Amino acid sequence: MALVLVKYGTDHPVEKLKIRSAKAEDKIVLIQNGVFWALEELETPAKVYAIKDDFLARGYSEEDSKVPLITYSEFIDLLEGEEKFIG
């Protein structure tokens, strides 16, 4: 149930095995240079999300993702995760 924040890509390759070692409960966010990992294979049982808007900001096509693309709105839905007393 760990939060994995990736804001690194290719210039930093250690996040790939972080993603590998991530658990089913854990959350993986690809932001900034993390969009490069959306083109990777990535052996992960965790919940992987790449920022769709930032992905587009980096100049990449949404078709060209191996991972799920979400917007900041859905990032807050991730931020919620469950339900709590938020609503």
Add this chain to the structure above:
Amino acid sequence: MALVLVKYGTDHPVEKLKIRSAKAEDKIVLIQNGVFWALEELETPAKVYAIKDDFLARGYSEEDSKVPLITYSEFIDLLEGEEKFIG
């Protein structure tokens, strides 16, 4: 400690007291139509942030907001915290 999310415009009465009765140790995020709370006279001891990218997307200006705005990058860092143990 508590993660407080608001994203139901002003149509959700419970949003007010979530902010209102928050602790000075908690985090409060305004997202989507929740940005309307960023314009009012909300008084909370918690860390209150409205999403800048989303707020500007509403057609408003940074100057319009009363509370601090964070960007997609800063939102990721919010969820990190400050200490970043992601090495």
